[PDB]
Amino acid sequence: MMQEPLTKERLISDWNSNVSVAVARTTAIAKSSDASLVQFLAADAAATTKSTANVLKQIEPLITQPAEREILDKIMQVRKTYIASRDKVSQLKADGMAEEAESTLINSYVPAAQGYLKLLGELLNLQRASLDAKAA
Amino acid sequence: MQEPLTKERLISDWNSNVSVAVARTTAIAKSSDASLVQFLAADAAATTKSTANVLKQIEPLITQPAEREILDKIMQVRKTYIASRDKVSQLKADGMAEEAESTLINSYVPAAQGYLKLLGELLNLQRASLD
């Protein structure tokens, strides 16, 4: 059974929210012809990725059992791809290279974001099941 | 324990939806390109339908006078919020680019902030039950 499942569930809820926010923001950036939009959203984007960095600092020590450790390792590998593609979409759009940004969005960012959210859901499912198994 | 836990989970989904909509609406307002209104419209409709579904799910689970008071206030604030959200997109579609930005700042964001504050208050009632 997962230990401290409720604490991890709350941290993953915030993490999921941050990913969902960043996906909405990056998608809007990629599809707008306004190259300056990435600059006008940059402080908000920095706040969202910092919030996840903080979640990671809190949650990593609490992820202990093999099933949740295996998922966390998978999340960290996909997150590397996700961050590289997010930053590339943003740089291309800032640089006026709109077609390349749109191509990167679909070819790289979207699959990485979808995998990131799917793995976060697998991680959450482990926690929720453990908590629901002790609730009574 | 199960009832406040289910409500906490629903409120966390609701909070995510509002947070996503605030980011999306902010991008629509600040983009000089008004085409985001149409290209993001189905994603925005899905985020707001998701919240409509959470509202239907959580209603039968409301048990306490303070929950009901907060939910009633959320319904009022959500009306103000939805009108302003929709107005940002209508202004962008109508070519009123500067007014879309000013309406974001002076109407949509304050309503969203009050909406999130109330969701936090509703969430804290569940945390109190779980502690």
Numbering used by the authors:
A (entry chain A): 57 to 192
B (entry chain B): 58 to 188
From the study:
Bacterial chemoreceptors sense extracellular stimuli and drive bacteria toward a beneficial environment or away from harm. Typical chemoreceptor proteins, such as the well-studied E. coli chemoreceptors Tar and Tsr, consist of three primary domains: a periplasmic ligand-binding domain (LBD), transmembrane helices (TMs), and a cytoplasmic signaling domain (SD). MCP2201 from Comamonas testosteroni CNB-1 binds different di- and tricarboxylates, which are represented by TCA intermediates. Citrate and L-malate have been found to be the chemoattractant and chemorepellent of MCP2201, respectively.
To further elucidate the mechanism underlying D-malate’s role as a chemotactic repellent, we determined the crystal structure of D-malate-bound MCP2201 LBD at a resolution of 1.5 Å. Consistent with previous reports, the structure of D-malate-bound MCP2201 LBD shared the same four-helix bundle (α1: Q59-K87, α2: A91-L118, α3: P122-A150, and α4: A154-E193) with the L-malate-bound structure, with root-mean-square deviations (r.m.s.d) of 0.43 Å, and D-malate occupied the same binding position as L-malate and citrate. The pocket was formed by all four helices. More precisely, residues Y138 and R142 interacted with the 1′-carboxyl group, residue T108 interacted with the 2′-hydroxyl group, and residues R135 and Y172 interacted with the 4′-carboxyl group. The malate enantiomers in the two structures appeared in mirror symmetry. The structure indicated a D-malate-bound MCP2201 LBD dimer in the crystal. In the analytical ultracentrifugation assays, the D-malate-bound MCP2201 LBD predominately occurred as a dimer, the same as the L-malate-bound LBD. The dimeric interface of D-malate-bound MCP2201 LBD consists of α1 and α4 helices. Hydrophobic interactions are contributed by residues L62, V77, A80, A84, and L187 from both subunits, while hydrogen bonds are formed by residues E65, R66, S88, S89, D90, and D188 at the interface. Taken together, D-malate triggers a similar dimeric oligomerization to L-malate.
